[PDB]
Amino acid sequence: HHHHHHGSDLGKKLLEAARAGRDDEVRILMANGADVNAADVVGWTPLHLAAYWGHLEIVEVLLKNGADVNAYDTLGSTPLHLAAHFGHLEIVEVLLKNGADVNAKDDNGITPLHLAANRGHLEIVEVLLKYGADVNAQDKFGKTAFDISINNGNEDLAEILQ
């Protein structure tokens, strides 16, 4: 899942277009054979970039063309981590519907549920729980989503978790 960084003209353009939200250019590039899992120097693939910047249609195109749904960056984080962290609900569903590892841990033991929890993204928390997220998973410091809810004073999130 760690895709190697070959700054090969079309992969590099694909990385740029996925970032900037250029749906058309992405379609063109994919049809011209661009590596759908080209990675930049931090291990981000076009699916990471689209998931971060909230570009739903590009996420869908990329997965349709064989994007690794569980691509890891150089610190172990996946596109679903990014989408959960930044509140992109519709992306979170598409990713999970396409086989994203709902319990993936980055190098710090942090899961998408932890990230969604920490920023109070409640609809994301529910979706992830719906897909099998381990409500009791602990990061490297022993913290659960519930612990996050207590530290942040987020009673609505504590309630969802029960």
């Binding site: 610190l75 984080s77 990061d139 410091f141």
Partner: protein, 578 residues
């Protein structure tokens, strides 16, 4: 021209947001009660630098403007971080373009680029900077500092940190006021009066190397040279110059507002003529850019480009002039890390000096045709804006009026630029003047785990910043001249994310704790250059009237598009459009 006053400050190892939020906003909030100020703008950068430009009404006296700015800044100095205050803040009243470049080479190739830059900084720059008419002087290189390059494996082996190194340097590179034997008021009958000399600043790598960090259980000694490499080297390593392909340094000189260009230039030459007889052997002054005869080439790569890729573009530009244009070009003075828009890893500039006019017969061999051919030749360089020019469409500021934040402002900008692109009949090349967000390494310190282990937050943050960013500790004396001492990690221990975990901090109980025990990290995007306009977050947008349209029509359209942006986003016209 409306006179402009510039404030510059620096914060070693700071990111753009840190600079903006501890320096730029503080200064801007205190730029009140100053007469005749038309507008203010700032950039806060990932190089740890800020530049705030205050532009005054036409006919303002630039002396009075500068004085008023300096005085308000003086009253705001106590509000700035000590790290910034101690670098020196400057305030200049100068033209934004260069009057001349003084180049320096060594013809015997016996001095490196770094040596040449130190020589210029230590022996030439200050006298030039005091010359009447000289408004700003940029060194194309850096003065030496004493560089303490720390090794985290050796620090950990002896149960030490960068905090212990800093403390020892402050204690043992010290200049002590110790009074006098027979000092006043004295006893009756005193025969002897003499100064007491105690510690004095260190002057050499050897002396820094023998700073005593600790004495072990068994009485063996740990010297600074046992945990660090000790060498003279630049205070920074951001700017490197070449003259016709050879190592160089020099001075870029900007004319003070209202000074006489010919008189200033002649005073500079007279000052260089006093220095020349004392140059070390091989050193020589060249004159690569005296303001026909000359032009510049800008090199601007996207944010995130390395020193190495900027260099590769400049080598292509230089090569073109020294081969394809060798009949017209006498010299090229190329600077990597400084550009038309100032300091950055992704920018460069080349100053080009033509052979005598008389030896360039033909319209095709005059400055205009040469720059046009060069711009065409450079128009296919990948992922770089490269153009050749001499020192007008529109200049638009998009403005955050409601606390929206950088991310929303970038979205509004992109909405406006998308809409502009759909009217190619009215507007052409509607673009941002600044830089795009790039990946940054976000590290969270876990306060609970730090407290549980007895590791101080101050020790953690000093360790991280000193090792990965560098820290100015105090001064020392190099060949009779006061200069700076910097501690930083040696390069090989601060290159990659896994290196974070080889740095250890000492807990209150004496145990060494690695960074990995109390921190976590992730990648995210943020800005390498945050802009402000009249004290508010801003993004500058340039562009022009499409062919056969007036500037007014194109401006009117820009305003119409701007009226359809998300709530809380305003705009203003600046520069040529004001």
């Amino acid at each position: 021209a409306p006179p402009a006053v510039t404030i510059s400050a620096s914060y070693p190892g700071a990111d753009a947001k840190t600079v903006q939020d501890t320096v730029t906003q503080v200064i801007e909030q205190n730029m009140n009660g100053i007469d005749n100020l038309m507008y203010m703008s700032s950039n806060s950068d990932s190089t740890g630098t800020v530049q705030i430009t205050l532009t005054f009404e036409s006919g303002t006296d630039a002396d009075i403007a500068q004085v008023q700015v300096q005085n308000k800044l003086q009253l705001a100095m106590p509000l700035l971080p000590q790290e910034v205050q101690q670098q020196g803040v400057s305030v200049e009243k100068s033209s934004s373009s260069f009057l001349m470049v003084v180049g320096v080479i060594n013809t015997d190739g016996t001095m490196t680029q770094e040596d040449i830059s130190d020589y210029v900084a230590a022996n030439m720059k200050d006298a030039i900077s005091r010359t009447s008419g000289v408004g700003d002087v940029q060194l194309f290189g850096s003065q030496y500092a004493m560089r303490i390059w720390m090794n985290p494996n050796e620090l950990n082996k002896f149960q030490l940190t960068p905090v212990d190194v800093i403390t020892a340097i402050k204690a043992q590179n010290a200049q002590v006021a110790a009074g006098q034997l027979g000092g006043t008021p004295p006893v009756k009958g005193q025969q002897l009066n003499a100064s007491i000399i105690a510690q004095t600043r260190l002057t050499s790598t050897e002396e820094f190397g023998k700073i005593l960090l600790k004495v072990n259980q068994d009485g063996s000694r740990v010297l600074l040279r046992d945990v660090a490499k000790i060498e003279l080297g630049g205070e920074n390593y951001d700017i490197i110059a070449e003259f016709n392909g050879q190592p160089a340094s020099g001075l870029g000189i900007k004319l003070a507002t209202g000074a006489n260009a010919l008189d200033t230039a002649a005073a500079i030459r007279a000052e260089l003529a006093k220095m020349e007889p004392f140059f070390p052997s091989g050193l020589k002054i060249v004159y690569p850019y005296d303001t026909q005869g000359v032009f510049m080439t800008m090199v601007q790569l996207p944010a995130g480009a390395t020193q190495e890729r900027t260099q590769k573009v400049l080598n292509e530009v230089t090569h073109y002039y020294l081969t394809k244009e060798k009949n017209n070009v006498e010299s090229v003075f190329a600077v990597n890390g400084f550009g038309f828009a100032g300091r950055g890893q992704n920018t460069g500039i080349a100053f080009v000096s033509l052979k005598d006019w008389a030896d360039r017969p033909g319209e095709e061999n005059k400055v205009e045709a040469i720059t046009m051919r060069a711009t065409r030749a450079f128009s296919q360089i990948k992922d770089a804006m490269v153009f050749a020019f001499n020192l007008t469409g529109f200049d638009f500021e998009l403005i955050d009026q409601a606390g929206l934040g950088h991310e929303k402002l970038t979205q509004a900008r992109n909405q406006l630029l998308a809409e502009a692109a759909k009217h190619p009949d009215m507007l052409t090349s509607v673009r941002p003047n600044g830089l795009e967000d790039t990946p940054q390494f976000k590290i969270d310190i876990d306060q609970e785990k730090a407290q549980a282990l007895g590791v101080s937050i101050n020790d953690i943050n000093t360790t991280l910043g000193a090792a990965w960013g560098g820290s100015y500790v105090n001064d020392f004396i190099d060949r009779g001249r006061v200069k700076k001492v910097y501690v930083m990690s040696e390069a090989k221990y601060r290159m990659l994310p896994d290196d974070i975990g080889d740095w250890y901090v000492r807990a209150a109980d004496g145990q060494m704790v690695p960074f990995s025990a109390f921190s976590s990290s992730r990648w995210e995007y943020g800005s390498p250059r945050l802009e402000r306009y009249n004290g508010l977050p801003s993004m500058e947008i340039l562009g022009q009237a499409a062919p056969g349209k007036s500037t007014g029509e194109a401006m009117e359209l820009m305003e119409q598009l701007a009226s359809k942006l998300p709530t809380g986003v305003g705009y203003d016209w600046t520069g040529m459009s004001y």
